[PDB]
Amino acid sequence: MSNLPVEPEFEQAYKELASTLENSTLFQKNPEYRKALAVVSVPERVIQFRVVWENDKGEVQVNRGFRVQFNSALGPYKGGLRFHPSVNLSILKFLGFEQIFKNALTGLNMGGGKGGSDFDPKGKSDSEIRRFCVAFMTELCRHIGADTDVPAGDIGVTGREIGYLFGQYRKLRNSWEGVLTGKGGSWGGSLIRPEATGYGVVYYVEHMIAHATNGAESFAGKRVAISGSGNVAQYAALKVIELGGRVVSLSDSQGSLIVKDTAKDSFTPAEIDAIAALKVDRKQIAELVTDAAFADKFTYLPGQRPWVHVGAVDVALPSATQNEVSGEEAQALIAAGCKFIAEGSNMGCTQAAIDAFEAHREANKGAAAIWYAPGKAANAGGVAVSGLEMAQNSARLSWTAEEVDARLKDIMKSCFQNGLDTAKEYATPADGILPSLVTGSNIAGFTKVAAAMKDQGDWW
Amino acid sequence: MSNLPVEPEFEQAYKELASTLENSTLFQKNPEYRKALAVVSVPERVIQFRVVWENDKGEVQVNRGFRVQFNSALGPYKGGLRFHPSVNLSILKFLGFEQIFKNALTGLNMGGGKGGSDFDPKGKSDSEIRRFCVAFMTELCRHIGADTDVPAGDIGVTGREIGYLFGQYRKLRNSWEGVLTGKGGSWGGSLIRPEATGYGVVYYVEHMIAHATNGAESFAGKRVAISGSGNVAQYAALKVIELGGRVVSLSDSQGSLIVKDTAKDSFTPAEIDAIAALKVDRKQIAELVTDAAFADKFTYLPGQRPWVHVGAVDVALPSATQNEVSGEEAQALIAAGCKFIAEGSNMGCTQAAIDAFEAHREANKGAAAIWYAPGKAANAGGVAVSGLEMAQNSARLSWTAEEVDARLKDIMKSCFQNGLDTAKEYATPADGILPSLVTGSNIAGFTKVAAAMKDQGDWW
Amino acid sequence: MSNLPVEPEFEQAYKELASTLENSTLFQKNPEYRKALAVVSVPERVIQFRVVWENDKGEVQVNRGFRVQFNSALGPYKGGLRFHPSVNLSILKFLGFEQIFKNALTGLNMGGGKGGSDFDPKGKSDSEIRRFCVAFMTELCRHIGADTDVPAGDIGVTGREIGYLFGQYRKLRNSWEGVLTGKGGSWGGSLIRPEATGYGVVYYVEHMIAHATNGAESFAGKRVAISGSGNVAQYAALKVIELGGRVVSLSDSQGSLIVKDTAKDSFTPAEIDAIAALKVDRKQIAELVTDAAFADKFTYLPGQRPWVHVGAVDVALPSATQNEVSGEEAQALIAAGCKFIAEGSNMGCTQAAIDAFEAHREANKGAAAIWYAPGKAANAGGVAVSGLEMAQNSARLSWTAEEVDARLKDIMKSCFQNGLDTAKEYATPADGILPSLVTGSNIAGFTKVAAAMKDQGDWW
Amino acid sequence: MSNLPVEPEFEQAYKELASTLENSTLFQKNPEYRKALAVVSVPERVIQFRVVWENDKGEVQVNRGFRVQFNSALGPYKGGLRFHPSVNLSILKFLGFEQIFKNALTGLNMGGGKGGSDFDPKGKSDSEIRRFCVAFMTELCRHIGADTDVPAGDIGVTGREIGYLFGQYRKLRNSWEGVLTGKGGSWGGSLIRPEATGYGVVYYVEHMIAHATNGAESFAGKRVAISGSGNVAQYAALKVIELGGRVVSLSDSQGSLIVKDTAKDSFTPAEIDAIAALKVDRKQIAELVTDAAFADKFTYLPGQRPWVHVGAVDVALPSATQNEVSGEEAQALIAAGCKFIAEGSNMGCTQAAIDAFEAHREANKGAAAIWYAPGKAANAGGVAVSGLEMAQNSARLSWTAEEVDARLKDIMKSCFQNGLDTAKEYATPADGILPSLVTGSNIAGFTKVAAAMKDQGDWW
């Protein structure tokens, strides 16, 4: 086994999934699925190519491009593209593995997969981005198609990158098919989709707190621990503020925007839009918080996570990146008086932190228990709108806003019902104790994907 | 002409169609279409390949696979797959020839064609079926495409076979297109279709009896001579019994399930479901009828068709296979007091039997005439739902049950009107005598297909 | 098994081969190969399409086109095209089955297969042939390629047909590859091939008589029973007379050109060229016998095969078609005193005739035994030249005549040695009795093709 | 950023090449090439797929398959396939990187690359190997083409594996092309394929001993410490014995085979054939020692390398594995009085061992001076013959033994001439201090491949 490379993130995801699948009743009823666990983990195809482009000064730059087509039991490969200098095979493997069950759990077509490169859009001109995208799509075009691969956007691939990539794909394939997602008016995309990711994340945040109180309490007198900046965080803030939700955290990556007067003062939507605009301009908070209005609205404590100075937060909502909540930070969250760890990223909670949360929740019988929130259960939404975008791209027509948001908010609800009805009593007995949601979602996705693979002859 | 091979079933079908087209006012008005009759009868492409698979004991097995793409004037080739040890080129040619006008008559745009193999799923393990499907799909996938060929199911190809075939096609083509019909939740199919065969069959059975009485008499106080033990019999029974439809026949293949008390006692739906379950378990009516409830409900007379012991049947519904009603059995039907020969399969009535039925009907002026019922004039619901399944496969979305059964029951009705309005006075003078249906249906299909071929330049 | 169609010629060939392989030491040593006999007899692909063309009067004509890709264990599919009104699937199946072992025995890197149509070039204008070729090439070009199918010429497909077919293939494929054989200066073909049809025939005729006498007697004082007219029969005749070869038979199909003075008078080569020219002009041997220069040479007896009036022929050379030597005619040959039945066609000897020849040869111990000559053991000269033509088409260059006829006559000799050495004591004990040639040839082909299929994983 | 994974063997290869290119005159003259070093080191396409096959007991087995297409500057990607339960991305990357300059140095028009899986052919039946090959070729066909990818054989992929893979490729693509290397004589003939590489290392050693001693030493009366069993080691032994040398080592993974009488004792060619026969069955050489002839001539050394126990040995040829010559073993070779260390595999010597060998190379001017010979410099010829098969596959022909042997002789001679021509220009030879050979080889390959990439626009 030592011959196989070690991928820490992917390995941790597999360990978590195996642990949750083991302590369950689906395994005992159908032991065959254990053999399925052998075939899900191996990606169906992993492609790693070399991208050679020309920078502004006229020099040759060489980067690596990855496309991890993990599983296509349920539909065509559907995953994003991440242009981040930290991208390698482990990260994309883990993200695609999560994507398979994210697309299965929320009752969609489309399979898993994830693409990207170690390209860094930071500090690059427009021409440099254009040249890299043109070179990247040449190497990638051989492996994507309207039914083969539909790459999407992620951290790094904004509207501009997706535009360049579509232009080159149309150049050298002479096709004009619905092969990428994230387009718009001048590429023939769909509404909501460019802002779907934040849409979906905030949808799941509000839904997760509503089900956290079981609908017995809106955000009245509730402090929210939003994380991140720019996209996702902006929409989360603007739809959390609506129900009197006291916003007390928008730590982008190092600078924590925590209100000095945690009791009364809260953020305003125009301020959040300014924050998003500043993040668009590739800048830290800095001049944002140093402005007089922002200076009097919230205090700045850079270099520490908001978990140190939560100011008795009501809901913990980490949404920056993976492993954004450490063990000591998780214990600080628990002691502060939080019963809802509504993490809004992929593996944003440290494995030790998740273990501590589970132990405390099973040791906190009653409404005053820390309810967990696994990443793949939340977020989504963007994937659904990307699916709708490809669906209307197939139809050679553009759906209206009412039609699109009626397709959504009517789907994903049946999918929530499916997830909760699968997690009715199977696994995590919850005999008087709060149930587990990781054990509510892992099996809820795994059963469907394993069924799909078994019914096609993938594993027997 | 002796150089051309002799196909008995295909030749019989061609003789029947030519005879009905000859005695028509379409022929005399447009003699050109005679030469069209030369071009329809030649299939556009017939592919016969060799399938080499490995059985359970580790031996090599060699079978033959056929794909008869007959005609695509109206749309892509659309036809089922039949895995039956009696399959050869004649059977598939005849079935595809019927399929062309079945798809033309009922307003569907898809073309004709039919596939299959001499494989026998009886007595084969799951692994044997899987292996054969994988080999078959390789050899066949060379010649199919989402717009080229969309194979469907038939006698032999259940959900499992279609699942295996789709899995292999997705393997070696890297596509995931809507290239086969008969999928479901774990392959991305459609609703209604898994029950479409029985759905459409019983729809047409009730339609044909309703048109038989012209709405004057529902199934109240009527004995129905259902045949077979497939969906064609199952749903037929379930939705004939609703209108007081006394059931007096469920002969699977040799064992006639005829009620001992033909006057009062009838079948029950739970018993029909039990028969379904045991047929799924690859068992005949044996061990069903022997049960006490089934013993007191109906008597068993194996080795004879139910026509000898109809018990004064009201409507005869032969639905087992081709040539299930012989001349003497047809005369027994006529003598018993049946005025509705409702053959619910393809070529289920023997040519001589059909001639006798027509001769008697033209000599039985009045409501007491034996009204005919050709196969392609019915049994189109399954085809319609398969078309809808392909249509929603193209759209990258899943229709609801209400949407699908609103598309149906609204189509096929305009198509029935089209057929009857085409056969209003065209041939068959019917001056006080009951008109013929085989004739009217033949012209109603042939005119549209010949028009399409003339308009595309196939024959001039 | 009755579901399988009955092919007379193919079944006869399969029976002959099975009987030959049964009475051998190969079966007993390796019983595994018996199961190989199940997989060879099923063609890998059989395609039958519909060809719709326009005749001179402006009417639509519909014909059938066949392409039987039988086996490709050894190389790409390599078979001819036959445009003859008697062409169906049985004939092409049998011809392709023979072709597989004809290409295996002669040490060639080419597979089997055979194509054709029921088109009749007789009585057709140039334009009619052109139009049919264009339509046929469209439908066929869907399923051929340089490494997929290389159709060749046969009875019906002259240089003109092959020219038209190449032109259309280059039109709609935009390729110009070596996809057909039988081209020339204006299509980029090869030398030797324009006369290869007669080249190979006469090569194998002279070689077979030389082996018949074992080199102990040239054609001095020998009467030859050549069959046919022109081309194959012509070039056969030209290099038989050279060794004082007395020619006493050039029966085209019904009119036997047998010399009145069988003792002294013989044919001349300008006369045979005239015969070939007249056959090119689509004229039988009628006016040719009327001329005094030909009238004083041979007597005309239409309606009988030349076996009735052999005039004590020395060597029998039936080369017209299949089953050209019947049982009674074979016994006439035996009574006349022929010890060399050198049939130069495929299945030219009737099964009963073959049995009688074998019985007499095993009952005629000594040099005065009727030595057999199977078709695939004969011919094969043109096959090699077509292979060389494809080989130099791959090389993008043209070989000289010396180069081509040095490649040949140096190959086919090692191949004859292979064929005879593989039949060295491999059954047919021949302990003082003349050995059998059908046995040797059949085993020598079958072992190589079965080895190739076993080594590629076709049968295990 | 350490986002790049760890590829230890690839790291050693790249470090060695960079160190060689630094300490030279190539970089100082042309500093441009420093960017070529960055561009060449990225594999340019890496495919990793998942292979799912059914074993003998009927269970699902999942493995990983790799294709590393490093460079196609000089020709289509050309590398082997290695089925061995230790194959991962690092191993195949390193092997492909070596192969690029191995194909560049010896004047070949093919590129780099390497494929394989962690399949373990040992302990599997024929059926299990067949099934795995079929699944592997199904998953691999999309990335394989005659002008795209021509995989070859290596440790694991014998004649049978190649046969199965070709057979599956032929039915999937419906094309017979020379896309794989190692095929049988009948189908894609391969002459002098096994024999090529074995004599190459001894040729290199004989040329170097001729040059080094100013023609004062020859291979007569020398001891050879060749290692490994089969292929290269066998033919190395045969060549040493044939010339007049004495073989004193045929060690393998488990133990060693040292002649008891080191002065006069060798291994007979019949004994070597027995070794080959037993190694075909994958059994250990230990039992081979237990044979009476071997028991009275050789002493087994289980779990120990022979190069410290043979004692005074003239020539060391560790052709078994990579990194099988340790630092302490290198100094043992120093003490043993070895004069020329040559590798039968890539990266035969440990980095420390290579350093010690090169440091001690400069001393002992004239004879002695154990002199490093990397794998690329010696191991060749077999790759050349593989290329020749591609040529023979392109021409649709089959070359004779004399032709292919003459081409191989010319190719090896040109390779040696060009390798030794660019010797002193970029490497420092001091004054009679035994100039380095690894440096010469590295520069001679890198200059040509960098030139090709610069001329095609890959790096500027």
mmCIF file of N, CA, C and O in Angstrom, chain C residues 44-45 69 72-77 109 146-148 388 390-391 394-395 399 407 448 452 454-458 460, chain D residues 126-127 130 159-160 162-168 170-171 173-177 186-188 394-398 403:
data_model
loop_
_atom_site.group_PDB
_atom_site.id
_atom_site.type_symbol
_atom_site.label_atom_id
_atom_site.label_comp_id
_atom_site.label_asym_id
_atom_site.label_seq_id
_atom_site.Cartn_x
_atom_site.Cartn_y
_atom_site.Cartn_z
ATOM 1 N N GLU C 44 -17.474 -11.744 -37.698
ATOM 2 C CA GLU C 44 -17.336 -10.682 -36.722
ATOM 3 C C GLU C 44 -18.316 -9.535 -36.973
ATOM 4 O O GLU C 44 -18.711 -8.851 -36.021
ATOM 5 N N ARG C 45 -18.668 -9.291 -38.232
ATOM 6 C CA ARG C 45 -19.609 -8.244 -38.549
ATOM 7 C C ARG C 45 -20.196 -8.503 -39.915
ATOM 8 O O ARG C 45 -19.472 -8.836 -40.846
ATOM 9 N N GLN C 69 -17.549 -8.821 -42.980
ATOM 10 C CA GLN C 69 -16.256 -8.816 -42.323
ATOM 11 C C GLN C 69 -16.216 -10.050 -41.442
ATOM 12 O O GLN C 69 -16.759 -10.042 -40.356
ATOM 13 N N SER C 72 -10.622 -10.987 -38.541
ATOM 14 C CA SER C 72 -9.485 -10.096 -38.660
ATOM 15 C C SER C 72 -8.430 -10.436 -37.612
ATOM 16 O O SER C 72 -7.804 -9.552 -37.048
ATOM 17 N N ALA C 73 -8.231 -11.711 -37.336
ATOM 18 C CA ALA C 73 -7.208 -12.124 -36.374
ATOM 19 C C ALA C 73 -5.806 -11.794 -36.883
ATOM 20 O O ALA C 73 -4.939 -11.364 -36.124
ATOM 21 N N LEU C 74 -5.592 -11.992 -38.181
ATOM 22 C CA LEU C 74 -4.267 -11.891 -38.765
ATOM 23 C C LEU C 74 -3.988 -10.487 -39.295
ATOM 24 O O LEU C 74 -2.880 -10.000 -39.171
ATOM 25 N N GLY C 75 -4.989 -9.833 -39.859
ATOM 26 C CA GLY C 75 -4.790 -8.483 -40.338
ATOM 27 C C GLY C 75 -6.128 -7.757 -40.516
ATOM 28 O O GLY C 75 -7.175 -8.217 -40.079
ATOM 29 N N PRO C 76 -6.115 -6.574 -41.142
ATOM 30 C CA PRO C 76 -7.345 -5.899 -41.515
ATOM 31 C C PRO C 76 -8.194 -6.758 -42.451
ATOM 32 O O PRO C 76 -7.685 -7.639 -43.148
ATOM 33 N N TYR C 77 -9.510 -6.512 -42.440
ATOM 34 C CA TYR C 77 -10.425 -7.187 -43.346
ATOM 35 C C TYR C 77 -10.036 -6.906 -44.792
ATOM 36 O O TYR C 77 -9.779 -5.750 -45.174
ATOM 37 N N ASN C 109 -0.553 -11.013 -44.320
ATOM 38 C CA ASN C 109 -1.014 -10.245 -43.179
ATOM 39 C C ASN C 109 -2.324 -9.539 -43.536
ATOM 40 O O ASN C 109 -2.421 -8.298 -43.536
ATOM 41 N N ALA C 146 -8.917 2.508 -43.991
ATOM 42 C CA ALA C 146 -7.669 1.932 -44.476
ATOM 43 C C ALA C 146 -7.240 0.786 -43.573
ATOM 44 O O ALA C 146 -6.712 -0.218 -44.062
ATOM 45 N N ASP C 147 -7.430 0.938 -42.257
ATOM 46 C CA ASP C 147 -7.128 -0.132 -41.313
ATOM 47 C C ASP C 147 -8.396 -0.874 -40.860
ATOM 48 O O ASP C 147 -8.367 -1.641 -39.890
ATOM 49 N N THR C 148 -9.525 -0.613 -41.526
ATOM 50 C CA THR C 148 -10.801 -1.230 -41.181
ATOM 51 C C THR C 148 -11.267 -2.203 -42.275
ATOM 52 O O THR C 148 -11.507 -3.371 -42.010
ATOM 53 N N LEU C 388 0.220 -6.482 -51.745
ATOM 54 C CA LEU C 388 1.360 -5.641 -52.097
ATOM 55 C C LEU C 388 0.881 -4.258 -52.511
ATOM 56 O O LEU C 388 1.552 -3.271 -52.228
ATOM 57 N N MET C 390 -1.786 -2.640 -51.431
ATOM 58 C CA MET C 390 -2.099 -1.921 -50.198
ATOM 59 C C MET C 390 -0.812 -1.546 -49.449
ATOM 60 O O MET C 390 -0.714 -0.471 -48.870
ATOM 61 N N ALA C 391 0.179 -2.424 -49.480
ATOM 62 C CA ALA C 391 1.449 -2.186 -48.809
ATOM 63 C C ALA C 391 2.174 -0.988 -49.413
ATOM 64 O O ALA C 391 2.783 -0.206 -48.695
ATOM 65 N N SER C 394 0.353 2.251 -48.514
ATOM 66 C CA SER C 394 0.792 2.743 -47.213
ATOM 67 C C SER C 394 2.108 3.520 -47.298
ATOM 68 O O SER C 394 2.239 4.589 -46.701
ATOM 69 N N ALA C 395 3.025 3.033 -48.143
ATOM 70 C CA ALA C 395 4.359 3.606 -48.256
ATOM 71 C C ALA C 395 4.381 4.937 -49.018
ATOM 72 O O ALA C 395 5.423 5.586 -49.048
ATOM 73 N N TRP C 399 5.996 0.795 -56.478
ATOM 74 C CA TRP C 399 7.029 -0.189 -56.755
ATOM 75 C C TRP C 399 7.107 -0.455 -58.252
ATOM 76 O O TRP C 399 6.105 -0.398 -58.969
ATOM 77 N N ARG C 407 8.963 -9.480 -55.097
ATOM 78 C CA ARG C 407 8.243 -9.721 -53.855
ATOM 79 C C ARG C 407 7.373 -10.973 -53.987
ATOM 80 O O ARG C 407 7.448 -11.885 -53.158
ATOM 81 N N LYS C 448 -3.195 -21.638 -37.986
ATOM 82 C CA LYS C 448 -2.670 -20.286 -37.861
ATOM 83 C C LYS C 448 -3.755 -19.305 -37.410
ATOM 84 O O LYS C 448 -3.545 -18.477 -36.530
ATOM 85 N N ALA C 452 -3.941 -17.332 -33.817
ATOM 86 C CA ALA C 452 -4.012 -15.877 -33.721
ATOM 87 C C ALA C 452 -5.168 -15.479 -32.816
ATOM 88 O O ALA C 452 -5.014 -14.610 -31.962
ATOM 89 N N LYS C 454 -6.628 -17.286 -30.432
ATOM 90 C CA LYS C 454 -6.332 -17.653 -29.068
ATOM 91 C C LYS C 454 -5.342 -16.640 -28.439
ATOM 92 O O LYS C 454 -5.402 -16.331 -27.243
ATOM 93 N N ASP C 455 -4.360 -16.187 -29.208
ATOM 94 C CA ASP C 455 -3.352 -15.305 -28.679
ATOM 95 C C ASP C 455 -3.901 -13.896 -28.472
ATOM 96 O O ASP C 455 -3.359 -13.125 -27.680
ATOM 97 N N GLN C 456 -4.984 -13.538 -29.180
ATOM 98 C CA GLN C 456 -5.591 -12.220 -28.996
ATOM 99 C C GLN C 456 -6.727 -12.258 -27.957
ATOM 100 O O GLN C 456 -7.254 -11.243 -27.556
ATOM 101 N N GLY C 457 -7.094 -13.427 -27.460
ATOM 102 C CA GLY C 457 -8.132 -13.542 -26.449
ATOM 103 C C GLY C 457 -9.545 -13.764 -27.017
ATOM 104 O O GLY C 457 -10.514 -13.595 -26.281
ATOM 105 N N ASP C 458 -9.681 -14.130 -28.297
ATOM 106 C CA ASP C 458 -10.991 -14.349 -28.871
ATOM 107 C C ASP C 458 -11.665 -15.593 -28.307
ATOM 108 O O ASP C 458 -12.843 -15.551 -27.958
ATOM 109 N N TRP C 460 -10.879 -19.089 -25.612
ATOM 110 C CA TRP C 460 -9.985 -19.610 -24.586
ATOM 111 C C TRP C 460 -10.395 -21.034 -24.184
ATOM 112 O O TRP C 460 -9.516 -21.737 -23.626
ATOM 113 N N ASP D 126 -4.399 -17.636 -16.377
ATOM 114 C CA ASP D 126 -4.471 -17.025 -17.696
ATOM 115 C C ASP D 126 -5.746 -16.187 -17.814
ATOM 116 O O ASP D 126 -5.761 -15.126 -18.419
ATOM 117 N N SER D 127 -6.853 -16.682 -17.275
ATOM 118 C CA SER D 127 -8.121 -15.990 -17.365
ATOM 119 C C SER D 127 -8.067 -14.663 -16.627
ATOM 120 O O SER D 127 -8.632 -13.673 -17.097
ATOM 121 N N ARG D 130 -6.148 -12.231 -18.679
ATOM 122 C CA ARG D 130 -6.923 -11.861 -19.854
ATOM 123 C C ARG D 130 -7.981 -10.814 -19.513
ATOM 124 O O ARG D 130 -8.144 -9.798 -20.221
ATOM 125 N N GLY D 159 4.552 -11.741 -23.553
ATOM 126 C CA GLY D 159 3.931 -11.894 -24.855
ATOM 127 C C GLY D 159 2.429 -12.033 -24.735
ATOM 128 O O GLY D 159 1.684 -11.517 -25.586
ATOM 129 N N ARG D 160 1.985 -12.720 -23.679
ATOM 130 C CA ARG D 160 0.559 -13.002 -23.530
ATOM 131 C C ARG D 160 -0.208 -11.718 -23.207
ATOM 132 O O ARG D 160 -1.288 -11.489 -23.754
ATOM 133 N N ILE D 162 0.638 -8.645 -24.013
ATOM 134 C CA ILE D 162 0.606 -7.856 -25.232
ATOM 135 C C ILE D 162 -0.457 -8.391 -26.182
ATOM 136 O O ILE D 162 -1.173 -7.603 -26.819
ATOM 137 N N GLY D 163 -0.547 -9.734 -26.286
ATOM 138 C CA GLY D 163 -1.540 -10.353 -27.150
ATOM 139 C C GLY D 163 -2.978 -10.007 -26.758
ATOM 140 O O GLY D 163 -3.789 -9.636 -27.601
ATOM 141 N N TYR D 164 -3.254 -10.061 -25.459
ATOM 142 C CA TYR D 164 -4.585 -9.754 -24.964
ATOM 143 C C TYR D 164 -4.908 -8.293 -25.205
ATOM 144 O O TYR D 164 -6.040 -7.959 -25.603
ATOM 145 N N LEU D 165 -3.945 -7.415 -24.917
ATOM 146 C CA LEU D 165 -4.176 -5.989 -25.044
ATOM 147 C C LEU D 165 -4.449 -5.655 -26.513
ATOM 148 O O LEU D 165 -5.340 -4.853 -26.816
ATOM 149 N N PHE D 166 -3.687 -6.244 -27.440
ATOM 150 C CA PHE D 166 -3.917 -5.987 -28.854
ATOM 151 C C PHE D 166 -5.278 -6.507 -29.283
ATOM 152 O O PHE D 166 -5.970 -5.857 -30.073
ATOM 153 N N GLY D 167 -5.646 -7.686 -28.798
ATOM 154 C CA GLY D 167 -6.908 -8.246 -29.204
ATOM 155 C C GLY D 167 -8.057 -7.359 -28.745
ATOM 156 O O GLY D 167 -9.096 -7.347 -29.386
ATOM 157 N N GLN D 168 -7.975 -6.780 -27.542
ATOM 158 C CA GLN D 168 -9.048 -5.921 -27.087
ATOM 159 C C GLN D 168 -9.039 -4.604 -27.836
ATOM 160 O O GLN D 168 -10.110 -4.089 -28.180
ATOM 161 N N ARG D 170 -8.161 -4.109 -30.877
ATOM 162 C CA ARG D 170 -8.639 -4.333 -32.224
ATOM 163 C C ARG D 170 -10.146 -4.348 -32.311
ATOM 164 O O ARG D 170 -10.695 -3.815 -33.279
ATOM 165 N N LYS D 171 -10.833 -4.892 -31.320
ATOM 166 C CA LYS D 171 -12.288 -4.946 -31.388
ATOM 167 C C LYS D 171 -12.912 -3.649 -30.884
ATOM 168 O O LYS D 171 -14.036 -3.342 -31.244
ATOM 169 N N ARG D 173 -11.524 -0.393 -31.310
ATOM 170 C CA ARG D 173 -11.354 0.643 -32.308
ATOM 171 C C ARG D 173 -11.770 0.174 -33.703
ATOM 172 O O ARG D 173 -11.883 1.003 -34.614
ATOM 173 N N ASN D 174 -12.005 -1.134 -33.881
ATOM 174 C CA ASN D 174 -12.331 -1.698 -35.183
ATOM 175 C C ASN D 174 -11.233 -1.323 -36.189
ATOM 176 O O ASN D 174 -11.505 -1.053 -37.360
ATOM 177 N N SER D 175 -9.982 -1.327 -35.731
ATOM 178 C CA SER D 175 -8.862 -0.914 -36.551
ATOM 179 C C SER D 175 -7.680 -1.812 -36.227
ATOM 180 O O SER D 175 -7.354 -2.017 -35.066
ATOM 181 N N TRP D 176 -7.011 -2.291 -37.265
ATOM 182 C CA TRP D 176 -5.801 -3.084 -37.122
ATOM 183 C C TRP D 176 -4.622 -2.180 -37.449
ATOM 184 O O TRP D 176 -4.386 -1.877 -38.612
ATOM 185 N N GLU D 177 -3.922 -1.735 -36.412
ATOM 186 C CA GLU D 177 -2.796 -0.826 -36.587
ATOM 187 C C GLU D 177 -1.681 -1.234 -35.641
ATOM 188 O O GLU D 177 -1.903 -1.917 -34.638
ATOM 189 N N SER D 186 2.912 -13.541 -36.536
ATOM 190 C CA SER D 186 1.805 -13.608 -37.481
ATOM 191 C C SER D 186 1.104 -12.245 -37.600
ATOM 192 O O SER D 186 0.822 -11.764 -38.703
ATOM 193 N N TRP D 187 0.906 -11.601 -36.451
ATOM 194 C CA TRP D 187 0.180 -10.341 -36.398
ATOM 195 C C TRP D 187 1.090 -9.261 -35.854
ATOM 196 O O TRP D 187 1.377 -9.267 -34.675
ATOM 197 N N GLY D 188 1.583 -8.399 -36.734
ATOM 198 C CA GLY D 188 2.568 -7.400 -36.335
ATOM 199 C C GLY D 188 3.904 -8.028 -35.957
ATOM 200 O O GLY D 188 4.290 -8.041 -34.796
ATOM 201 N N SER D 394 4.095 0.417 -40.147
ATOM 202 C CA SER D 394 3.659 1.508 -41.010
ATOM 203 C C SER D 394 3.664 1.087 -42.475
ATOM 204 O O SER D 394 2.805 1.539 -43.245
ATOM 205 N N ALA D 395 4.639 0.260 -42.867
ATOM 206 C CA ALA D 395 4.823 -0.112 -44.265
ATOM 207 C C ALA D 395 3.856 -1.209 -44.725
ATOM 208 O O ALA D 395 3.894 -1.597 -45.893
ATOM 209 N N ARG D 396 3.043 -1.762 -43.817
ATOM 210 C CA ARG D 396 2.167 -2.891 -44.108
ATOM 211 C C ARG D 396 2.966 -4.066 -44.666
ATOM 212 O O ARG D 396 2.528 -4.736 -45.599
ATOM 213 N N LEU D 397 4.152 -4.303 -44.098
ATOM 214 C CA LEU D 397 5.099 -5.279 -44.602
ATOM 215 C C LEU D 397 5.759 -5.999 -43.422
ATOM 216 O O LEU D 397 5.427 -5.745 -42.266
ATOM 217 N N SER D 398 6.661 -6.931 -43.742
ATOM 218 C CA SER D 398 7.386 -7.670 -42.726
ATOM 219 C C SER D 398 8.836 -7.822 -43.176
ATOM 220 O O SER D 398 9.114 -8.558 -44.122
ATOM 221 N N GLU D 403 17.588 -7.815 -42.630
ATOM 222 C CA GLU D 403 17.314 -6.396 -42.781
ATOM 223 C C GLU D 403 17.272 -5.709 -41.412
ATOM 224 O O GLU D 403 17.896 -4.669 -41.199
#
